[PDB]
Amino acid sequence: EVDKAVPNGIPPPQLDLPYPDSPETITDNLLKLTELTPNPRHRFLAKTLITHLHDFVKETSLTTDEWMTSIQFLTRVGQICTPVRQEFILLSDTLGVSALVDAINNPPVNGATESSVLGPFFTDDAPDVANGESIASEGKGDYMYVEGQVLSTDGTPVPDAVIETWETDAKGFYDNQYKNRDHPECRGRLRSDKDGKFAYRAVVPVAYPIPGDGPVGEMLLQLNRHNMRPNHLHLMISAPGYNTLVTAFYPEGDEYLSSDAVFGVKKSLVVGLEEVKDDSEARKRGFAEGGSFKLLKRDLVLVPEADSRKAREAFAQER
Amino acid sequence: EVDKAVPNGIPPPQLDLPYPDSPETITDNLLKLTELTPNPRHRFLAKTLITHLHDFVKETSLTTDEWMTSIQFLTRVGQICTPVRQEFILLSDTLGVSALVDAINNPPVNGATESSVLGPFFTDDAPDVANGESIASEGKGDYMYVEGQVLSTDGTPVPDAVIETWETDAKGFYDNQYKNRDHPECRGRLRSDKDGKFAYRAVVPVAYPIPGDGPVGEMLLQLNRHNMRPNHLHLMISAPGYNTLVTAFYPEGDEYLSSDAVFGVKKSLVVGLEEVKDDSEARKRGFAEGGSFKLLKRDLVLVPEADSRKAREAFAQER
Ligand SMILES: CCCCCCCCCCCCCCCCCCCC(=O)O[C@H](COC(=O)CCCCCCCCCCCCCC)COP(=O)(O)OCCN
Numbered sequence: 122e123v124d125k126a127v128p129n130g131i132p133p134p135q136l137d138l139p140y141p142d143s144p145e146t147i148t149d150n151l152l153k154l155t156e157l158t159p160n161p162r163h164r165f166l167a168k169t170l171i172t173h174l175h176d177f178v179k180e181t182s183l184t185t186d187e188w189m190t191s192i193q194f195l196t197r198v199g200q201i202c203t204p205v206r207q208e209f210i211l212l213s214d215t216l217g218v219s220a221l222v223d224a225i226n227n228p229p230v231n232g233a234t235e236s237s238v239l240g241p242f243f244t245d246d247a248p249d250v251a252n253g254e255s256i257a258s259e260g261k262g263d264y265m266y267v268e269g270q271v272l273s274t275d276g277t278p279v280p281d282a283v284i285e286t287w288e289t290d291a292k293g294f295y296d297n298q299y300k301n302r303d304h305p306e307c308r309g310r311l312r313s314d315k316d317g318k319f320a321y322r323a324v325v326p327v328a329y330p331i332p333g334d335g336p337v338g339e340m341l342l343q344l345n346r347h348n349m350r351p352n353h354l355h356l357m358i359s360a361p362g363y364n365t366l367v368t369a370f371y372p373e374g375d376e377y378l379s380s381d382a383v384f385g386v387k388k389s390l391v392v393g394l395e396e397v398k399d400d401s402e403a404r405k406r407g408f409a410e411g412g413s414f415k416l417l418k419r420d421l422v423l424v425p426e427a428d429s430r431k432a433r434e435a436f437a438q439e440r
Numbered sequence: 441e442v443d444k445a446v447p448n449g450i451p452p453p454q455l456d457l458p459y460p461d462s463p464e465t466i467t468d469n470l471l472k473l474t475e476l477t478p479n480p481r482h483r484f485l486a487k488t489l490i491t492h493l494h495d496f497v498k499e500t501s502l503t504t505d506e507w508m509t510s511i512q513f514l515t516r517v518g519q520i521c522t523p524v525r526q527e528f529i530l531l532s533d534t535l536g537v538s539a540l541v542d543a544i545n546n547p548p549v550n551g552a553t554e555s556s557v558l559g560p561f562f563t564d565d566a567p568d569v570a571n572g573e574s575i576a577s578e579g580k581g582d583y584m585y586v587e588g589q590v591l592s593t594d595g596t597p598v599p600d601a602v603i604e605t606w607e608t609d610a611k612g613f614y615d616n617q618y619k620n621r622d623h624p625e626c627r628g629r630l631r632s633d634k635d636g637k638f639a640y641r642a643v644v645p646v647a648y649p650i651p652g653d654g655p656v657g658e659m660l661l662q663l664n665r666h667n668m669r670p671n672h673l674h675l676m677i678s679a680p681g682y683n684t685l686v687t688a689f690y691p692e693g694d695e696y697l698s699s700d701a702v703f704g705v706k707k708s709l710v711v712g713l714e715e716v717k718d719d720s721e722a723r724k725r726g727f728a729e730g731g732s733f734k735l736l737k738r739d740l741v742l743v744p745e746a747d748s749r750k751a752r753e754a755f756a757q758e759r
């Protein structure tokens with residue numbers, strides 16, 4: 122049995138739509154119809170999409186089998202998605218779309234910190250961590266210290282900003298990739314102080330794979346691409362009056378830096394960690410075993426919300 | 441909990457991939473990587489796809505919310521697909537892609553019969569119907585007679601071709617849209633005779649809606665488009681040595697002819713049914729109530745398989 126469908130009530134259009142006598146007329150008629158779309162933003166998106174879609178098909182002479190393979194692929198991508206897995210985001214990520222959209226929507230005007238992709242490992246349950254405390258238990262990897270200031274593009278400190286941070290442990294796992302999730306690990310939620318300063322202890326993150334077991338994984342193998350991300354520390358900074366910044370810093374030295382499978386890496390976000398070999402200083406910062414630590418010293422420069430919106434709308438006129 | 445992912449074993453590429461310092465470099469790097477795709481057809485498809493995708497994003501300055509809406513839409517489309525519902529095909533259909541691909545892959549060489557979309561109502565269980573017999577029980581709608589000849593493009597009759605035909609009843613339902621499907625209705629499987637001739641009784645099909653209750657239905661309403669198909673009779677003709685023809689004929693007089701929601705209609709496939717007001721002839725053809733019938737007289741011209749393939753690859757030279 123199959124459902125009886127129901128007419129949606131839209132009338133036959135009063136437009137000149139000649140019966141297609143060649144493949145081009147399909148496109149022409151569809152584009153004519155698209156002009157009936159009443160929201161002009163929707164109309165623009167629809168028109169531009171259709172043109173690209175039809176041009177793609179014409180340029181490639183897509184075959185029946187290739188079209189059907191595409192259909193089945195897109196279907197399987199949707200069907201593997203769950204509240205804990207977003208294969209369509211992963212497809213957007215690996216095809217560079219996520220990163221391109223992210224850039225366009227968060228233009229780094231006036232020397233702002235650049236954004237980078239969020240990925241799937243953010244949790245809204247990270248513990249509160251005071252400045253100087255650790256997001257990582259002892260034994261989760263090599264010591265790293267992170268510090269800087271949250272500032273406006275004009276240089277003014279931003280107090281009370283919320284800084285969410287998360288990363289892998291030394292094995293390349295986020296805390297929710299373990300069976301025993303008794304307590305959060307390698308993540309924290311901080312607040313910039315009254316001078317906009319923040320500091321915390323952490324571990325040196327490591328490279329890791331994105332999901333290669335579903336359709337996106339199959340695609341990467343046909344493209345002879347890897348499914349790896351280089352090491353990074355995630356940060357998300359929010360503060361009323363500013364454009365929320367979702368970003369990451371990528372330590373130098375990782376062989377995947379130039380070929381991030383999701384195009385998170387940006388030049389300004391690759392950081393050279395400083396080796397601090399000063400046992401006294403290490404212990405004073407609260408590293409329990411002292412010795413030495415890698416230092417990641419970086420400010421987080423936020424764009425006032427009105428400036429971000431203005432930049433985006435002004436740049437969208439060019440394009 | 442989330443799965444540990446696994447590296448796919450592809451190495452970091454030895455390519456010059458500068459860390460993006462502007463959004464354009466995302467695209468440049470992705471296109472460079474794409475050259476590692478080993479199958480040159482895949483490489484071509486991937487490259488063309490990526491360029492269109494990235495151009496679409498740049499031209500529109502797609503917003504974060506629009507991107508996320510798209511993601512969620514595509515997800516829902518996949519998730520509603522089942523063995524009995526293909527919402528991705530419906531999306532391809534309503535955006536004209538299915539019809540465009542179908543045309544390109546079944547070029548009407550030497551004025552052969554043009555193809556048209558299959559839709560979802562084909563069944564491989566249709567009963568055998570002898571020439572002159574009916575695919576429709578009495579009381580399923582207005583009488584129609586269908587006849588013609590199956591031929592090669594050189595004019596040679598094609599004997600023993602298998603002709604699958606199906607259609608709605610006068611209420612606009614296919615047989616599998618009813619609770620009681622004890623037996624097939626308004627469908628049949630014929631064989632062309634030794635002179636390539638076929639003939640059968642049927643009913644005049646009627647306009648009907650495609651599924652409007654899923655994501656594609658929501659999209660059509662935002663585009664101020666209807667979800668209707670004009671009246672049509674489906675045919676699928678197969679014969680060893682020839683390109684299988686999936687087509688449909690669309691009776692004149694239907695207000696949706698110019699605006700088929702899935703772009704099945706083609707100029708050559710619109711047919712003017714002849715009103716035969718001849719009680720005697722109606723009875724002689726086996727119409728039980730006599731009176732009158734509409735006549736659909738159309739030949740089915742098949743392309744020899746080698747010719748179809750040649751035409752397609754020659755046309756792909758242009759593009
Ligand atoms: C907007 C204008 C531009 C759009 C125009 C076209 C969109 C629809 C048509 C898709 C065309 C398909 C051809 C692309 C091929 C690329 C990869 C080729 C290699 C390959 O074999 O990949 C298989 C299928 O991948 C695939 O099927 C990849 C499909 C990619 C889908 C298109 C983009 C998805 C959306 C991205 C994010 C959405 C954000 C919203 C803006 C993987 O399968 P396999 O190798 O295991 O087996 C089948 C192999 N013979």
Ligand SMILES: CCCCCCCCCCCCCCCCCCCC(=O)O[C@H](COC(=O)CCCCCCCCCCCCCC)COP(=O)(O)OCCN
Pocket residue numbers: 163164166167170188191192505506507509510513514528531532535537655658659662663
């Ligand atoms: C070869 C295989 C082929 C497979 C088929 C091709 C696949 C191509 C991709 C199709 C994506 C279309 C998704 C649009 C969903 C819109 C409908 C959602 C439901 C709903 O009621 O949403 C409304 C949106 O309608 C609207 O937005 C109506 C306007 C429709 C515009 C369509 C273009 C939008 C951007 C899509 C980019 C995808 C990249 C290419 C793969 C309100 O929500 P809203 O108003 O906020 O929605 C704006 C963001 N779209």
Ligand SMILES: [Fe+3]
Pocket residue numbers: 240242353355
């Ligand atoms: Fe990550």
Ligand SMILES: [Fe+3]
Pocket residue numbers: 559561672674
């Ligand atoms: Fe139909």
